[PDB]
């Protein structure tokens, strides 16, 4: 419940529903619609 986010913000990722301009969408974080942005 909690690693795919710690993964994320592990490697410099942020769990937004919508990516920044100019961020890649490379995993999913925890929780629903949580996409991994780096
Ligand atoms: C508000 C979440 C608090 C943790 C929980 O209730 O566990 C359920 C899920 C488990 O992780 P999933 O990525 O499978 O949702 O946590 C995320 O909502
Ligand atoms: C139906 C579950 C969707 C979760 C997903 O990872 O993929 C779809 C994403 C969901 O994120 P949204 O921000 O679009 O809701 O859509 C991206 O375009």
């Known amino acids: 419940?909690?690693?795919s986010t710690?993964?994320?913000?592990?490697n410099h990722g942020h769990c937004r529903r919508l990516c920044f301009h100019g961020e890649?969408?490379?995993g999913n974080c925890n929780?629903?619609?949580q996409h991994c942005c780096k």
Do not use: E, K, T, V
């Not at 710690?6 to 592990?10: E, P």
């Open 1 to 3: 419940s909690y690693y």
């Open 6 to 10: 710690l993964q994320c913000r592990n």
């Open 24 to 26: 890649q969408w490379i």
């Open 31 to 33: 929780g629903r619609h």
